[PDB]
Design a protein around this ligand. Structure first.
Ligand SMILES: *[C@@H]1O[C@H](CO)[C@@H](O[C@@H]2O[C@H](CO)[C@@H](O)[C@H](O)[C@H]2NC(C)=O)[C@H](O)[C@H]1NC(C)=O
Ligand SMILES: *[C@@H]1O[C@H](CO)[C@@H](O)[C@H](O)[C@H]1NC(C)=O
Lengths: 50, 50
């Protein structure tokens, strides 16, 4: 039975805030289709070839 | 069938008599008189546009 991840509560309070001290520039890749093959069919030739 | 017959370099086995591509369409044939393999290319076709 899958975990869904590692459980990690947060030390929440009404008066305790966490500020980051150091930062990382990361690079990620996102990929998307833009078009497809421009297929074409001669119905006449296909159905009744000669 | 119909097409253009051309010389080929495909080494058909002695018992082999036909060639087919992924489409199972005839690819090449061996002359019954000369044990030579000839490729079949469908005749040039397409569509005329203006
Ligand atoms: C911020 O973080 C980066 C990396 O997380 C720190 O850069 C490293 O600094 C250590 C010094 O302890 C070097 O040994 C490493 O070679 C550094 N790596 C890179 C990729 O730069 C940087 O010093 C941190 N800065 C602060 C102010 O915390
Ligand atoms: C029969 O085929 C062979 C193979 O090409 C050829 O050499 C022979 O000449 C053919 N027969 C005749 C009578 O030509």
């Amino acid at each position: 039975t899958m975990s869904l991840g590692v459980e990690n509560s947060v030390a929440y309070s009404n008066n305790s805030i966490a500020i980051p001290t150091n930062f990382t520039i990361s690079v990620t890749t996102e990929i998307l289709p833009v078009s497809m093959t421009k297929t074409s069919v001669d119905c006449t030739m296909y159905i009744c070839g000669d | 069938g119909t097409g253009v017959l051309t010389e080929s370099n495909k080494k058909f086995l002695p018992f082999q008599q036909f060639g087919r591509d992924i489409a199972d369409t005839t690819d090449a044939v061996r002359d019954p008189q000369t044990l030579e393999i000839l490729d079949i290319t469908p005749c040039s076709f397409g569509g005329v546009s203006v």
